[PDB]
Amino acid sequence: PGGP
């Protein structure tokens, strides 16, 4: 999570 929090990725591109």
Place this chain on the structure above:
Amino acid sequence: ANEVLLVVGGFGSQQSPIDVVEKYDPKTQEWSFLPSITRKRRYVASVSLHDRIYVIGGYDGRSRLSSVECLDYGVWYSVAPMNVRRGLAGATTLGDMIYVSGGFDGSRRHTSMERYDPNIDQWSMLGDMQTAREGAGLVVASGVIYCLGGYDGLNILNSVEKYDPHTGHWTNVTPMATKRSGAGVALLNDHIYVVGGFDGTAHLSSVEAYNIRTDSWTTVTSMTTPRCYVGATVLRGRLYAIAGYDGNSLLSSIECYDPIIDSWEVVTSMGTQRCDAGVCVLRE
């Protein structure tokens, strides 16, 4: 002395895993390409061991990988695969062996850790952690392995586990102040630095450091920019934060934390833009 930074794979600006291998020289501030890996791999980990680069698992855009390939520091070649497909696993070296824990196989996040012996080209399963973790790095200090934060499939984690090779067991130590997944981790002057990551809501520029003697965390000066799925390594007594994702775009820069000035400086902005690449140090 004349060590350099190596950065392999990750997620590129074409929105897919890449095979690019680069080295950065902090002294000359020059970058250079090395031979590309064979399979494009994001969510990948790298370690260096006895002038050998290892690229471990990751994800090719189709499946999570247990395969591992090696380069003598050059031509890339395949060695024995891990027992578990692992993307976003932690990886480190200890006593001529590679340890790899956690990760994500496309269905489950792992508690498991396994160990690679180059002398016999085999991976052996070891004791499971207490919490399953993707996005948690591994760091060795004084013969012991630490696994920090990550994501268990439901929550970002601030817990930290410690593996004692003499007991073969995991125990807990004082947790980080911030829940972090995708943070970079490295040991600098007997402190474990955790840089950036993702806390569930925000991409972080914050930094914490763990004093092992006192079992305590303290806040460190924040980086110049948020960085998630960022690598961290120490060279010549300085901490480097490499590439990553600032929540908006992929980054091409490396910044360097110097304890003498207690601040972060950008030392280059000219790498390939990428995140969740693998990083390690080469002794030339």
